[PDB]
Design a protein around this ligand. Structure first.
Ligand SMILES: Cc1cc2nc3c(=O)[nH]c(=O)nc-3n(C[C@H](O)[C@H](O)[C@H](O)COP(=O)(O)O)c2cc1C
Ligand code: F3S
Lengths: 410, 1483
């Protein structure tokens, strides 16, 4: 309910700090093209139910738009617009040629079936094919969406445009023309960011104590990368608890025994709750778990020098203020979790070029982009006495506002 | 019983090896028992290579080709000739059409007269068939494949015809002889063996035990290829999975021969035959024998940190395509030119083998099987678990297991395949939604929830991290008899292992467990590559809401998902058929995961019982050969107990999503109770349910969830035979019972009531584990309780009669209430029948744990029963020796029944000799397949002193008897106890179960005088609640089956059956007697007489009446009196006598077994579902004798003890004078010393004699359980090597074991003791000059030992004493060690850290001067008595040795010792200091 107002307020703060007039705020508060469509669908029983669609292009002054698609049964226009603005901020921070956007459908993948999902996606594309194209829009994977849906969308856009357009949609399967490393992008991004933050703060990465709560694919890949680099992991947690060992935890063995879900806790052994896990001694803390964990009570108990919010807004304003007062570096989530967007951009570039890179090349390009962006934001945040979240928002809005001013819409 | 082989490594052949193998079999014979007559052969056979020399010399009419280019067959025929020649022609036709040329046929001469009567009667005819080789068959592997094809086709044709014939073996390198023969009879019978023309490389052998007295020639092994030991507990799920994969096997080596070989296993065959069939198919498929053996019997690959990465990947890959075959087993297979030997994943059988300078490996069960030159013996090793003893005749070397395993693992890139092809289903963290229905109460009532169930089963799980406990085991009537509507789950009772296999533990043996579950579709087993492993794998069977939604939302084309509505309207058959149609349509489309959901259920659609639906789907899928292509996930609301969970997994469910339980937790958290967060609560519930599932698995012994998944380990009680065959095929049911229509009516009634529910918004209180007025009826209602108490206290007979009437009539409580007398006979006067004094001598009090009860209550029970003249009992908690002397007032607190439980707490020479009878607690009614836990808080000093443990230390009683790994070991223990107390009667305690008749027959053959059948209705001090409710069966079925089986086998006149469990009335006593009881046990009723109010809080140790609490404050409130118990027993006897007058029976043995006087009451017919039961099984009397007359002749005579030792030692023992003798002992002599120890203890007592009074010498191999129950003052110099269970139950004295005199190699590095040593001992010394076996010093409780290395699981459950290991140590050392010390020598400290189990042990380095001096003195005595070079070198280098030693001590033991030492230094008395330290520790 408050997501749109919060986004507008933070955008207003960033614009005020920049010093641009109010015309840029007036233009950027609201997405420039919101479309609501109704998608007919045929169920297995033969009955027809109508799903409500959505699509929002926050801005396209920079160039082609981009956004994900969530099959979340509570998706609404306010959430869609807020997510479009958020994606635009991500693109601005990473310095991509994207403007920003988001789509969604009001449905329930749980009760929905396989062929019915196929037909739903196909009807969605038939509905919104007019305002979507290689130079106008670019769907991407998101909540309740993955490679099969990407492939169906690609196949249908090929059918409707009568010519192959692999670069039309990102996140495709490898055989269809996908990009390698699509699953470890977030882990690689957070690895680069933690490395650079440690370098800037003087904390030696060699022997650095690390805690990774939340052991999904992101946590597993981050732990593996930290172990490869040299830093020791002194804590892991998952849905079934956690562990603790000041002198390493055999990340190789943990990954070898890693199951489908990433659960690692023993059966007949006591576990440590995340609340006490946060308090354990460590140099860097990486909350990548349920949101609203760092608050006033645990702000005084946190001990890590560097906190990276790989998740979406795991902290709160009070916790951010307390950490800033304590002089604990806080990495914004907008920069922490941009690996997915960066790898999607690389996939789009590969499709457009028609030639596919390799894992090493993707690694090098991704790390270069991440280090450059992090260095720029760190320099700006130290030049101006502000919080890193404010610096991230300000940097993200700078490119969009300046491009709009050049293009003369204002 | 056992196995054996005498192989020459280099390949040279002679008749000497065959003769030595026959001698080995003859020596092994002694292990088995006696059947109907000693001449009968329970089963034995011998295996050799093809004797081409003898064949060419003898046949004289076959042009035998070269060695490898033909095969030899062995066929068993009936006595008739028409079918013989018909089958001969048909086999020739098979060979001709397959293209091979038949060389001819031969008849084996046989000596029929050299055989016992039964085997002579069943003597089948033998003919050997010679097969030819065509030029196309270049390779002997192809030749063997064609021979296997021919054999399987012939077997298929035979079974189709219905004839009775068997192929003993058909191979080009193995010919097998076997039958119902004793080894001394085999040579005479098979006159071929006597010829001096045989030349073989190896000679495998085996002797069976034949649990039942009716075996057949075919069943007895050696099988076609391998010899098998023990039993397989997964042989139903095994067969189901194998039949499922049968339809889908495809390969190129067999071509189209799979159609011919479609039946790959014998359904009617036993475990050994089934294993041989499957193994032979796998190895013929194109895999190496070692590779397929490793595939079938894997090591513990999950939870083990001592395994290499290549091995872990190997086993992870193979577990994904083929399940493990758990159970006690010692495989020893062959393939003509290669040999192997394996133990199960837990190593539950002994295997010790020799090596000589002439390359003569002697692998056998025991050590002294044959005479060997100690100057030529080279290695004395043990086949440790997870180690492959592999031999290759052509190479003539013992190929090392490490390199075999390494190269097998590296043959393929399994690590890369696992790393790459695994599928990730990482859920979205932003897709969270705490689901709610808004009809929580309605759904809960529909699925049968109760407020009692919630508040007593769900909150306690979260609070305690484990399943909640209980006491006073279930007494409610069965679901089939209960009038109240009950879910289908209550009809199914869990099962457990009694004999032929131990119930393995879980918490302490976590390294062996494996909870990995695979979801998806298996690939081509015969040619597997990456698609067998492109599957989802889970860590726990249970699932959370987020996980379930992720699985459903996965849209990968290979891993599809389908949802099937498991609901019905009127016709259950229509519903099941429709569900099958959806399933098969989805499979045709290509799905791999099925979701059975009970959601979307309204007043018009009701849910099928999830167990029934899952079983029907699984059976249909298995029958149609598509189960391997799908994965059945189940989402049913009625899933909240570990019992329901285990039933679902066992009968097919891939995963469970207790959405109803999760919603209930959400509602409670929203309300405010259970303050813990929702996610933490969900995780804790999942972990607890997985722990419970592991516990249920451990009860049976299946250590793998994957194996248990196929395994059907439930016994329906009240389901019709037709329904069982249709949907639950393979399940055991005795009485038939309700039908599908009745089940549907019950479900519809429950659903309609729940969805009506138009009066209140509350859940009716449950009555499963407590009594609430208007709820489910219970046996002990307050009316019965206080009527019984009043009658007993008043000595009034009318009140007792009213109590009996109330307890028996007005309801259906048990099966025995459905029996009624005919009423038309000749009554006899009360003065003409046997008397009450004669009645009361056949009663028992049942085992009563001293820890569970109070001293006052226990002494009252004992005094009452002893005064009455019956037989009291003492629980597993031992007994203070002060009770063995009558008091001045005449009271006698001595217990006539001394119990020998798994703990072996108070087992001692005095404690055993001062007794009248001995029991062996194989299991109890409540917690059969589980042990116990007595934490520091509940173990008081006045209990610890009696139980021989430190005060305030949490004791652990292992579930299984570590001395009982099979019926042979049970017989050995029975003999040991009889030798310990020649003047007592041995007893065993079983529980009613399917096959209990077979187990009883086996026990009777094992020569147990008395068998006790205890129903699950019996009580218990503490046990898990689901184990209370859903374990065991009523004792009526067990007693009936045992009596029928025993008296059919002919051994019923050699044992004395008994009964106990809710024997509350003389009517119950008469029912038991008619069913075939002889003596009865009353435990729950005496407690009620004494003052117990059935409050069900014994586990809490807070009894308000002070009957089962150790607190002195509560004990002061006790009010019992032995007079009340005497009155109760007298009233029971008088009522029984009145019924004897009514029935006109003159004497006990005259009435016993007269089941013809029983007929079903009309009330059973009136009952709406109980009328569908079939009672002819219990109402049936085969001809025979029905009373104990024979004395159950033991073999105490002719023992070396009585023959030689005692006759020259009576004077020494009686005069207290020193005496020395030397004796030659062979493996046949089993115990060798327990008799002298018992004599010493009886003559003197606990004090014993001065140190080193009797110095017995010994030489050569010793027998099993050598030197058991040796008291203080004795000394057994055993200058040789021994067998298992050395020093069992030691109670003082020394035991010195040194290698042979002619053995010059590293005796400190060659094993010299069996698996288990010093089990349950209390105090003594020991000096072993060599490595020990697996589970060394299992329950040491004060015995100091010195060993040079030990096996695995060593020092498992120590509670005192000390151990000094001068060498390496196996994995999982000190698993559960709650006391004592272990000065373990080691060099690689970190490797020792990793090997040890870190749960409950703290490590140090020696700093105490007293500790150093004690170790130095122990090593000095060790060297002085042994002359060990390792010990001498350690003494020389003491300076380095003190630094290199490592000390291990538990935290609680260390803290208690420190506190008591501090108090003693302060200067307080021992008792007060102990009490103060205990209070401080357990505040
Ligand atoms: C409080 C209590 C404790 C028991 N403890 C043991 C025990 O430690 N070992 C055992 O074998 N049976 C134990 N039992 C079971 C009885 O000894 C006996 O085997 C039988 O179950 C009693 O049946 P009943 O309820 O008709 O008296 C116990 C029973 C009760 C009620
Ligand atoms: S059930 Fe147990 S707690 Fe006391 S009242 Fe009876 S002995």
């Amino acid at each position: 309910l408050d997501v749109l107002k919060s986004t507008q307020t933070v955008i207003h703060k960033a614009l005020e700090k920049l010093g641009y007039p109010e015309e840029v705020y007036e233009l950027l508060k609201e997405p420039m093209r919101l479309l609501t469509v109704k998608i007919p669908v045929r169920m297995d029983d033969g009955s027809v139910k109508i799903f409500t669609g959505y699509r929002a292009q926050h801005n396209d002054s920079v160039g082609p738009t981009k956004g994900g698609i969530r099959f979340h049964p509570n998706v609404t226009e306010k959430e869609v617009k807020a997510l479009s603005i958020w994606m635009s901020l991500k693109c601005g921070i990473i310095d991509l040629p994207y403007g920003g956007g988001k789509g969604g459908i009001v449905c329930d993948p749980r009760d929905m079936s396989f062929r019915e999902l196929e037909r739903l996606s196909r009807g969605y594309v038939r509905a919104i094919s007019q305002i979507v194209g290689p130079t106008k829009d670019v769907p991407a994977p998101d909540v309740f969406t993955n490679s099969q849906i990407m492939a169906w969308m690609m196949d249908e856009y090929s059918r409707i445009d009568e010519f192959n357009s692999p670069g039309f949609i990102t996140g495709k399967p490898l055989v269809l023309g996908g990009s390698h490393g699509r699953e470890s992008a977030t882990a690689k991004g957070v690895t680069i960011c933690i490395k650079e933050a440690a370098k800037k703060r003087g904390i030696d990465i060699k022997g650095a104590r690390v805690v990774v709560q939340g052991f999904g694919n992101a946590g597993s890949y981050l732990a593996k990368f930290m172990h490869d680099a040299g830093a020791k992991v002194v804590g892991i947690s998952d849905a079934y608890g956690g562990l603790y060992d000041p002198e390493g935890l055999d990340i190789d063995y943990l990954l070898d025994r890693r199951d489908s879900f990433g659960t690692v806790t023993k059966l007949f052994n006591d576990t440590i709750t995340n609340q006490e896990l946060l308090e354990l001694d460590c140099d860097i803390l990486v909350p990548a778990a349920i949101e609203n964990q760092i608050t006033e009570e645990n702000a005084h108990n946190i001990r890590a020098k560097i906190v990276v919010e790989a998740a979406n807004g795991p902290t709160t304003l009070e916790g951010t203020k307390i950490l800033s007062d304590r002089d604990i570096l806080l990495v914004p989530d907008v920069l922490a979790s941009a690996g997915g967007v960066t790898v999607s951009y690389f996939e789009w570039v590969q499709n457009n070029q028609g030639f596919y890179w390799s894992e090493e090349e993707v690694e090098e390009k991704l790390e270069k982009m991440m280090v450059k962006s992090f260095n720029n934001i760190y320099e700006m945040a130290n030049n101006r006495r502000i919080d890193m979240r404010l610096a991230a928002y300000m940097v993200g809005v700078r490119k969009m506002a300046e491009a709009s001013r050049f293009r003369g819409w204002i | 019983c056992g196995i054996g082989l005498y192989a020459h490594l280099k390949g040279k052949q002679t008749h000497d090896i065959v003769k030595q193998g026959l001698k080995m079999l003859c020596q092994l014979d002694h292990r088995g028992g006696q059947g109907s007559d000693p001449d009968t052969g329970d089963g034995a056979g011998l295996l050799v290579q093809i004797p081409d020399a003898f064949f060419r010399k003898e046949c004289k009419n076959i042009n035998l080709p070269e060695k490898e280019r033909y095969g030899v067959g062995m066929v068993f025929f009936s006595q008739k000739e028409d079918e013989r020649k018909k089958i001969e022609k048909q086999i020739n036709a098979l060979i001709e059409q397959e293209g091979q040329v038949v060389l001819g046929w031969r008849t084996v001469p046989v000596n029929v007269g050299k055989i016992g009567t039964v085997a002579q009667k069943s003597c089948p005819f033998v003919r050997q068939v010679f097969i030819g080789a065509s030029s196309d068959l270049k390779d002997n592997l192809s030749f063997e494949r064609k021979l296997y094809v021919i054999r399987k086709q012939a077997e298929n044709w035979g079974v189709t015809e219905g004839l009775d014939f068997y192929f003993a073996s058909l191979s080009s390198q193995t010919i097998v002889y076997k039958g119902l023969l004793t080894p001394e009879q085999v040579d005479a019978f098979y006159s071929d063996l006597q010829d001096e023309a045989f030349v073989s490389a190896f000679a495998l052998v085996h002797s069976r035990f034949s649990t039942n007295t009716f075996p057949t020639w075919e069943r007895a092994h050696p099988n076609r290829y391998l010899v098998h030991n023990g039993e397989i507990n997964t042989l139903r799920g095994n067969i189901n999975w194998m039949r499922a994969r049968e339809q889908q096997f495809v390969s190129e080596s067999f071509g189209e021969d799979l159609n011919k070989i479609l039946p790959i296993l014998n359904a009617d065959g036993s475990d050994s035959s089934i294993l041989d069939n499957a193994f032979e198919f796998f190895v013929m498929a194109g895999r190496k024998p070692a590779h397929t053996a490793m595939m079938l019997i894997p090591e513990p690959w999950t939870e083990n940190t001592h395994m290499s990465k290549e091995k872990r990947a190997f086993y992870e890959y193979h577990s994904s395509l083929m399940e493990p075959w758990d159970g006690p087993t010692a495989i020893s297979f062959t393939d003509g030119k290669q040999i192997g030997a394996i133990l199960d994943r837990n190593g539950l059988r002994p295997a010790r083998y020799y090596v000589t300078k002439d390359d003569y490996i002697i692998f056998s069960s025991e050590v002294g099987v044959i005479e060997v030159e100690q100057e030529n013996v080279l290695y004395k090793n043990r086949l440790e678990p997870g180690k492959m003893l592999l031999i290759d005749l052509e190479e003539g070397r013992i190929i090392s297991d490490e390199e075999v395993k390494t190269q097998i693992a590296t043959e393929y890139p399994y690590q890369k395949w696992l790393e790459e092809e695994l599928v990730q289903v990482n859920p979205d963290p932003e897709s969270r939604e705490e689901e709610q229905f808004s009809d929580l109460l309605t759904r809960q009532k529909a699925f049968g929830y109760t407020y009692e169930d919630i508040q007593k089963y769900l909150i306690p799980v979260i609070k305690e991290g484990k399943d909640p406990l209980g006491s006073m085991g279930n007494d409610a009537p069965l679901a089939v008899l209960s009038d109240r509507a009950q879910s289908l789950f209550n009809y199914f009772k869990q099962l457990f292992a009694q004999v032929t296999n131990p119930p393995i533990d879980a918490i302490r043996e976590q390294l062996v467990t494996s909870t990995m579950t695979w979801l998806g579709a298996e690939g081509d087993l015969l040619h597997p590559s990456e698609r067998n492993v492109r599957r989802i794998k889970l860590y726990t069977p249970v699932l959370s809401n987020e996980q379930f939604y992720a699985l459903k939302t996965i849209v990968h084309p290979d891993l599809k998902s389908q949802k099937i509505d498991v609901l019905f309207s009127e016709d259950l058959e229509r519903g099941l058929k429709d569900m099958f149609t959806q399933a098969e349509k989805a499979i045709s489309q290509g799905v791999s995961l099925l979701i059975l959901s009970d959601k979307k259920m309204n007043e018009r659609l009701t849910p099928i019982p999830p167990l029934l639906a899952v079983s029907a789907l699984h059976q249909h899928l298995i029958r149609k050969g598509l189960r391997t292509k799908v994965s059945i996930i189940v989402e049913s609301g009625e899933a909240r107990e570990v019992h329901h969970f285990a039933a679902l997994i066992g009968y097919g469910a891939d995963a469970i999503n207790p959405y109803l339980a999760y919603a209930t937790y959400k509602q409670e958290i929203d309300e405010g109770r259970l303050d813990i967060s929702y996610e933490e609560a969900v995780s804790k519930y999942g972990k607890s349910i997985t722990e419970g599932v592991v516990k249920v698995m451990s009860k049976m012994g299946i250590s793998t969830v994957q194996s248990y998944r196929g395994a059907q380990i439930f016994e329906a009680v009240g389901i019709s035979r037709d329904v069982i065959d249709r949907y639950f095929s393979g399940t055991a049911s005795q009485l038939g019972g309700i039908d599908l229509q009745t089940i549907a009516e019950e479900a519809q009634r429950r659903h309609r009531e729940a969805y009506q529910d138009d009066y209140s918004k509350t859940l009716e209180p449950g009555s499963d584990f407590q009594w609430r007025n208007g709820g489910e009826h219970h046996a002990f209602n307050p009316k019965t309780i206080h009527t019984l108490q009043w009658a007993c206290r008043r000595n009034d007979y009318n009140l007792f009669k009213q109590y009996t009437k109330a307890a028996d009539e007005e309801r259906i409580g048990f099966l025995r209430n459905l029996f009624a007398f005919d009423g038309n006979r000749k009554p006899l006067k009360l003065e003409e029948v046997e008397s009450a004094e004669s009645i009361v001598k056949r009663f028992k009090t049942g085992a009563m744990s001293f820890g569970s009860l109070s001293k006052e209550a226990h002494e009252a029970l004992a005094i009452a029963m002893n005064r009455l003249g019956g037989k009291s009992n003492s629980g597993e908690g031992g007994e203070d020796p002060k009770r063995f002397v009558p008091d001045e007032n005449g009271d006698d607190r001595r217990s006539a029944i001394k119990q020998i439980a798994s703990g072996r707490f108070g087992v001692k020479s005095h404690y055993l000799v001062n007794a009248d009878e001995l029991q062996i607690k194989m299991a109890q009614g409540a917690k059969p397949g589980e042990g116990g836990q007595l934490p520091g808080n509940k173990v008081y000093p006045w209990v610890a002193d009696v139980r021989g443990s430190t005060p305030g230390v949490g004791l652990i009683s292992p579930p299984p008897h570590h001395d009982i790994y099979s019926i042979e070991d049970l017989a050995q223990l029975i003999h040991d106890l009889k030798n310990a107390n020649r003047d007592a009667r041995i007893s065993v305690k079983l529980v009613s179960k399917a096959g209990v008749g077979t187990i009883a027959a086996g026990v009777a053959k094992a020569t147990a005088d008395v068998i006790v059948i205890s129903g699950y209705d019996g009580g218990t001090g503490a046990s898990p609640k689901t184990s209370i409710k859903h374990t065991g069966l009523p004792w009526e079925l067990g007693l009936a089956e045992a009596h029928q089986t025993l008296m059919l086998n002919g051994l019923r006149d050699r044992v004395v059956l008994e009964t106990d469990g809710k024997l509350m009335t003389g009517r119950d006593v008469v029912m038991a007697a008619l069913l075939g009881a002889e003596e009865f046990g009353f435990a729950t009723a005496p407690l009620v007489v004494l003052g117990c109010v059935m409050m069900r809080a014994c586990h809490l140790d807070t009894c308000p009446v002070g009957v089962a609490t150790q607190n002195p404050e509560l004990r002061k409130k006790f009010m019992g009196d032995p007079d009340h118990i005497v009155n109760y027993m007298l009233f029971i006897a008088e009522e029984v006598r009145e019924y004897m007058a009514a029935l006109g029976f003159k004497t006990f043995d005259e009435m016993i077994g007269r089941t013809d006087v029983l007929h079903v009451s009309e009330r059973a017919k009136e009952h709406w579902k109980a009328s569908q039961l079939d009672l002819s099984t219990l109402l049936y009397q085969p001809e025979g004798v029905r009373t104990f007359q024979s004395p159950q002749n033991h073999k105490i005579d002719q023992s070396l003890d009585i023959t030689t030792i005692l006759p020259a030692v009576q004077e020494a023992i009686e005069s207290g004078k020193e005496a020395d003798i030397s004796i030659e002992i062979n493996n046949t002599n089993r115990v060798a010393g327990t008799i002298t120890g018992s004599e010493i203890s009886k003559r003197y007592g606990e004090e014993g004699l001065p140190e080193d009074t009797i110095k017995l010498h010994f030489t050569g191999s010793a027998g099993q359980s050598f030197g058991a129950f040796v008291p203080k003052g004795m000394t057994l110099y055993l200058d040789g090597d021994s067998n298992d269970y050395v020093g069992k139950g030691l109670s003082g004295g020394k035991i010195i074991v040194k290698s042979s005199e002619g053995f010059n190699s590293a005796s400190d590095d060659n094993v010299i003791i069996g698996n288990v040593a010093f089990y349950g001992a209390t105090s003594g010394e020991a000096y072993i000059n060599g490595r020990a076996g697996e589970r060394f010093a299992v329950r040491n409780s004060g015995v100091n030992v010195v060993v040079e290395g030990i096996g695995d699981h060593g020092c498992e459950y120590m509670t005192g004493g000390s151990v000094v290991v001068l060498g390496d140590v196996g994995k999982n050392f000190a698993a559960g060690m709650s006391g004592g010390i272990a000065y373990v020598l080691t060099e690689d400290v970190k490797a020792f850290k990793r090997k040890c189990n870190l749960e409950m042990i703290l490590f140090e380095s020696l700093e105490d001067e007293k500790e150093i001096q004690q170790i130095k003195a122990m090593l000095e005595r060790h060297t002085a008595y042994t002359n060990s070079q390792k010990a001498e070198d350690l003494l020389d280098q003491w300076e380095d040795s003190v630094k290199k030693f490592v000390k291990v001590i538990p935290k609680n033991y260390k803290q208690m010792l420190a506190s008591i030492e501090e108090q003693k230094a302060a200067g307080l008395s021992d008792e007060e200091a102990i009490m103060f330290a205990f209070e401080a520790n357990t505040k």
